[PDB]
Design a binder for this molecule. Structure first.
Ligand code: ADP
Ligand code: BEF
Ligand code: MG
Lengths: 108, 605, 15
DNA sequence: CGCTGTCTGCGAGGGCCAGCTGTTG
């Protein structure tokens, strides 16, 4: 396994005058020049502007028991944390219309 | 001190009225009495501040009342408040302002905390303080010098005279801060006690511990919560935080067993560590990280048996980081208070529900254990569903004419048996048990008079518990009553008024009592105050009945013993008559039966 | 659904 | 003939009520 991606992508930057790494859901741009050895011209972040606020994000760190719900490696074994996720999904499934997806951390 | 024409303490020349009084919900009279409004938008914030500085006197559902006492204030500074913070917030809450007398009074009882500290180390008690001047002032006091063992300055003081030292320290306006720095105490080994994740403490439980552990050090004091609120869990949690050897002092053999079970249920401590020290048996108290006992066993004054003496020798020669004292209100007794000095403990945590006594010794808990750290509001918890809703009642049972003929004439203390053994009262108890059993309710019946307890137990053919019954036998009845559907009603005596955990006991009845013991009444109602499984907040899940004999001295005691409960908002509806009694085949339906009963009562003497 | 008895539900005072 | 469990007295104590002095207007 390699350790830095700049090595294999180096020819792209030199051969081609300019490369635009367009992406969505991008974690902050300043890291990429550190990960990939290049000097970006601009670091622009765009937020969609719509008449209606389509996306409604939220974070649920506390359940009905007001207990920490972090899926920490040491706290993963907690029954309450496991119960809280089932409670959230069960309750949410009641209100959420057809179509829903849940993402875990690992298969195990 | 001006008195109106209607014997009213006129306080209009004393304090003014604030312009924005509608938002401000607090009154503050120069007497110290504080009348808070429960319907104000800012009630929640005011109550927590007020309950800390002032111990509640009465808390009906609408307008609460508190009183300011030196001991009440001394608790405020210990938790973390300061004179500037209390008075400023009090003035902010006051809709009439704080009179100059109270304003100076609050200041007076706040410049006394922190001057002197009491530290126990290496089985030695020392009077620690960072100011030599206050120590020198104490030395001038005669008794303080008398109890002495025969920058920061500390002089050792003999263990046997800790009580006298503490009592005089308050009298000298220099309370001893018996505060334990458990987190910075590696001398005592840390125990493997840990709070299992399955155990979650309710907001009032956590709030009480927050006052106890406001700073890194652990505070020693009396924590008051309603019966059935879960004081066992709070006591267990205190041990978990300390992580040191813990001594738990129950009230009887039933108390320790429930303490043992609660530790196992609410803590990861292994069964081997948990031990008991009771006349029934002992789980090797010599080797144990958590010791459970009773005031009677430790407080026993006569020479102890060899089996108990060996354990007692170990207990005295030990260092305890946390000594949980269940049923604190019994501590100020003449001998039970000695148990504090006999055992060496750094932080003394006190758990109780009825911080009331018919004597004036209840105030001694301020220095015997510490300030009242917390006091939950019964109605607040009742509405939250943490404790079952109880519809208290007082069934008025008319006195039998044959009995009353004797009761009025007889005055040689034989009245108690006469109106305790009232046939009319018996029928009401007999009918009530029958009706409530048909409703799948778990009945509990109490009776101070064992004679009455036995008379009713056999006549109704229901199990009864009292002194002579062996620990195993009484323990068996509770387990049957807890689980066995056949045993739906049990009879108990003064033994089981406290520490008996019967979560499913919906109904309670009382046919006798020991005078006007508010502690007995509030404790007795506690058994059925535990939260029920299918409990609903506003459905009156549980019920309490205090059978009384009309036109009898029991009426005076019935009103006397209801003082504490009504102070917490409980309303004792009066039941002059019970419907459906006539159509019921109840006992003592003939004068011959009643005539026979009266003769037996007279014979008992 | 296990309603309260008459005496507890409503006042028993003659007045 | 020994050992363990049951039951019954000795001694003490808690909680509360009521009483004959001690004290104050
Ligand atoms: N946080 C809790 N979660 C679940 N049950 C609880 C909790 N706290 C207390 N309980 C239950 O309430 C009862 C408390 O009994 P106990 O500790 O003897 O009360 P107290 O000492 O206040 O009289 C028990 O049935 C106990 O299991
Ligand atoms: F207040 Be509980 F019954 F110990
Ligand atoms: Mg308890």
């Amino acid at each position: 396994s390699c350790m830095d991606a700049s090595l294999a992508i180096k020819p792209v930057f030199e051969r081609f005058q300019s490369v635009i790494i367009t992406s969505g859901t991008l974690s902050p741009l300043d890291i990429y020049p550190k990960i990939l050895d290049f000097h970006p011209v601009t670091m622009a972040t765009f937020t969609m502007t719509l008449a209606r606020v389509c996306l409604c994000p939220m974070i649920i760190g506390r359940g009905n028991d007001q207990v920490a719900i972090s899926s920490k490696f040491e706290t993963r074994e907690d029954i309450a944390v496991i119960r809280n996720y089932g409670n959230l999904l069960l309750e949410m499934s009641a209100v959420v219309p057809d179509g829903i997806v849940a993402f875990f951390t690992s298969y195990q | 001190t001006k008195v109106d024409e209607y014997g009213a303490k006129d306080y209009r020349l004393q304090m003014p009225l604030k312009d924005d009084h509608t938002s401000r919900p607090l009154w503050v009279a120069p007497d110290g009495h504080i009348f808070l409004e429960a319907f104000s938008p800012v009630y929640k914030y005011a109550q927590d501040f007020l309950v800390a500085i002032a111990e509640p006197v009465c808390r009906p559902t609408h307008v609460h009342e508190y009183k300011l006492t030196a001991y009440s204030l001394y608790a405020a500074v210990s938790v973390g408040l300061q004179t500037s913070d209390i008075t400023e917030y009090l003035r902010k809450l006051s809709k009439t302002g704080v009179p100059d007398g109270i304003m100076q009074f609050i200041k007076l009882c706040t410049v006394s905390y922190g001057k002197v500290k009491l530290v126990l180390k290496h089985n030695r008690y020392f009077v620690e303080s960072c100011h030599p001047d206050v120590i020198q002032h104490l030395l001038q006091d005669p008794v303080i010098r008398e109890c002495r063992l025969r920058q920061t300055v500390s002089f050792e003081v003999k263990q046997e005279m800790i009580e006298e030292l503490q009592k005089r320290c308050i009298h000298l306006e220099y309370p001893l801060l018996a505060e334990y720095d458990f987190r910075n105490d590696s001398v005592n080994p840390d125990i493997n006690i840990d709070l299992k994740p399955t155990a979650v403490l309710r907001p009032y439980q956590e709030k009480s511990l927050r006052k106890m552990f406001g700073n890194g050090r652990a505070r020693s004091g009396v924590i008051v919560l309603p019966c059935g609120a879960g004081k066992s869990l709070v006591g267990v949690t205190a041990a978990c935080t300390v992580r040191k050897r813990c001594l738990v002092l129950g009230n009887s053999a039933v108390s320790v067993e429930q303490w043992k079970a609660q530790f196992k249920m609410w803590s990861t401590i292994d069964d081997s560590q948990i031990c008991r020290f009771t006349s029934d048996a002992k789980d090797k108290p010599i080797g144990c990280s958590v010791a459970i006992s009773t005031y009677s066993m430790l407080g026993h004054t006569t020479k102890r048996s060899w089996e108990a003496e060996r354990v007692m020798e170990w207990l005295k020669t030990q260092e305890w980081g946390l000594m949980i004292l269940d049923e604190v209100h019994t501590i100020p007794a003449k001998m039970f208070r000695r148990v504090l000095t006999i055992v060496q403990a750094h932080c003394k945590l006190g758990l109780t529900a009825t911080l009331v006594r018919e004597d004036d010794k209840i105030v001694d808990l301020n220095f015997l254990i510490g300030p009242k750290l917390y006091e939950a509001n019964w109605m607040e918890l009742q509405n939250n569903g943490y404790i079952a809703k109880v519809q208290c009642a007082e069934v008025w049972c008319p006195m039998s004419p044959e009995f009353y003929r004797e009761y009025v004439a007889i005055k040689t203390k034989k009245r108690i048996l006469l109106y305790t053994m009232n046939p009319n009262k018996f029928r009401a108890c007999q009918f009530l048990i029958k009706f409530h059993e048909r409703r799948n309710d778990k009945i509990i019946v109490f009776a101070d008079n064992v004679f009455a307890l036995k008379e009713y137990a056999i006549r109704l053919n229901k199990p009864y518990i009292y002194g002579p019954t062996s620990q195993g036998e009484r323990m068996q009845i509770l387990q049957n009553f807890k689980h066995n559907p056949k045993i739906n009603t049990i009879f108990i005596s003064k033994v089981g008024d406290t520490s008996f955990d019967l979560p499913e006991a919906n109904v309670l009845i009382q046919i006798s009592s020991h005078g006007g013991s508010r502690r007995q009444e509030a404790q007795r109602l506690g058994r059925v105050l535990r939260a029920k499984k299918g409990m609903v907040a506003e459905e009156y899940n549980a019920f309490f009945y205090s059978l009384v004999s009309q036109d009898t001295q029991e009426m005076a005691y019935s009103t006397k013993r209801q003082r504490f409960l009504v102070d917490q908002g409980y309303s004792f509806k009066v039941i002059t008559k019970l419907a459906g009694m006539e159509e019921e085949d109840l006992a003592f339906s003939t004068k011959e039966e009643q005539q026979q009963l009266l003769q037996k009562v007279l014979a008992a003497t | 659904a296990k309603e309260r008895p008459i005496w507890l539900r409503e006042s028993t005072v003659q007045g």
